[PDB]
Symmetry: C3
Subunit: 110 residues, 3 copies
């Protein structure tokens, strides 16, 4: 899976090693080996979320595993909200998740 | 809607509060409530646009509203070019917009 | 084409003008005029790739040219791995490429 996290929290306000903890959390939540988990964190951005510039985060999750129903992703979403609210001290209203399906041909390795 | 703006303008050259004005402009242009508008601005990047490293911006617009025709998005595109040319003092040739359709199941809230 | 490169290499560790060389390389690899090639480089990010926070890069390639088979993109992928390994002194295991198809209606110009 590919996780991309954008936040308007300054880089020096984002907990040290967040990318490592989100990698390990995503492997457990998604039921994927950690050696197939990828995390990118982009802090210090200018962001409005739901019309507001209070601290926020946007998480994108792209995977071959993504099934096009909410019920299929709802448990995963809840886990990622729990993860980010505790790590970044954000309210649930200050996080949004987007899920994107991928097919194997899209991924270039080696 | 989700707007993401990449620019090679340094963060301290991007007008203060651009994310707030682009949020309000997008709500008006797209005909969506501002409490459903999300804007991310990533400045200070290294960018080439149309083969050139003059100042530029790339805007991505993702929404449940996106209809897969140019005629459907042409009025919106024109408004966003007017917005960015005036805010960032860019020529029309130094902006590109990409539109992406979303479905409701892709968006994780609460 | 639209290329987006994320890396955890600090901005001052990324070779000067990488965006220009990747633009020119992409035009040659993809067989597209350089005036239709767009490159965004986002350095200094926090990243894990394949579970690890060693230096890495993620490259996304979006184009009207993208055919949904690996065999169609395998030669391009190999060229981009050769390009990034030499520019960023990364091992082949520290790069991943994602390919995304676009249609003309998605691109707002003028």
């Amino acid at each position: 899976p590919f996780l991309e996290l954008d936040t308007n929290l300054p880089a020096n306000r984002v907990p040290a090693g967040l990318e490592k903890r989100l990698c390990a959390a995503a492997a457990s939540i998604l039921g994927k080996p950690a050696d197939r988990v990828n995390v990118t964190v982009r802090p210090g951005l200018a962001m409005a979320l739901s019309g507001s510039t209070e601290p926020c985060a946007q998480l994108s999750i792209s995977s071959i595993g993504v099934v096009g129903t909410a019920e299929d992703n709802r448990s995963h979403s809840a886990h990622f909200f729990e993860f980010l609210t505790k790590e970044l001290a954000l309210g649930q209203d200050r996080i949004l998740i987007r899920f994107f399906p991928l097919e194997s041909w899209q991924i270039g390795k080696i």
